[PDB]
Write a protein that binds this ligand. Structure first.
Ligand SMILES: CCCC(=O)OC[C@@H](COP(=O)(O)O[C@@H]1[C@H](O)[C@H](OP(=O)(O)O)[C@@H](O)[C@H](O)[C@H]1O)OC(=O)CCC
Length: 143
């Protein structure tokens, strides 16, 4: 199985240094108001050695997964790029928002771990790359 490892090594070598290799949740923050929602604070590490924070709420995760399913899922009429996508924790219509967010920490950690282990054509999808890059608002915060 030496051939397999050597190939795995060759393929990784070709990825740009800014590709994400891990993403783990560091905390959650409540955004108060007429209606409140929660934001996940995520620590990302890249192939090139960078480490930084991004801030994402659940509906941003759901919008990304909807795109991936249309492009690489079962009902995706593009067979060539099809693969097994991880399932995203489901929507919860009603309930205590802070408890729902806390329950999603380990579930979203598993989903991100599985996503970053997918084939190169998914890792390089422009929307997946944008989701893990620092937006201007993420980078102007002091960790
Ligand atoms: C007739 C009544 C139908 C009905 O209740 O629809 C409601 C929505 C479901 O509501 P959504 O807003 O699409 O979905 C909610 C957001 O994803 C929210 O994200 P965040 O934490 O970042 O705020 C999650 O926390 C909630 O658990 C989830 O339910 O459904 C859709 O948007 C599909 C269109 C029908």
């Amino acid at each position: 199985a030496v051939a397999q490892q050597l190939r795995a090594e060759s393929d990784f070598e070709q990825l740009p240094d800014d590709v994400a290799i891990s993403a783990n949740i560091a905390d959650i923050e409540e955004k108060r108001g007429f209606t409140s929602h929660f934001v996940f604070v995520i620590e990302v590490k890249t192939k090139g050695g960078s480490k930084y924070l991004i801030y994402r709420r659940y509906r941003q995760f759901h919008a990304l997964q909807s795109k991936l399913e249309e492009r690489f899922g079962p009902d995706s009429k593009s067979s060539a790029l099809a693969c097994t996508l991880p399932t995203l924790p489901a929507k919860v219509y009603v309930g205590v928002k802070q408890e729902i967010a806390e329950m999603r920490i380990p579930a979203l950690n598993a989903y991100m771990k599985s996503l970053l282990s997918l084939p190169v054509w998914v890792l390089m999808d422009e929307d997946v790359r944008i989701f893990f890059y620092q937006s201007p608002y993420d980078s102007e915060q002091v960790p």
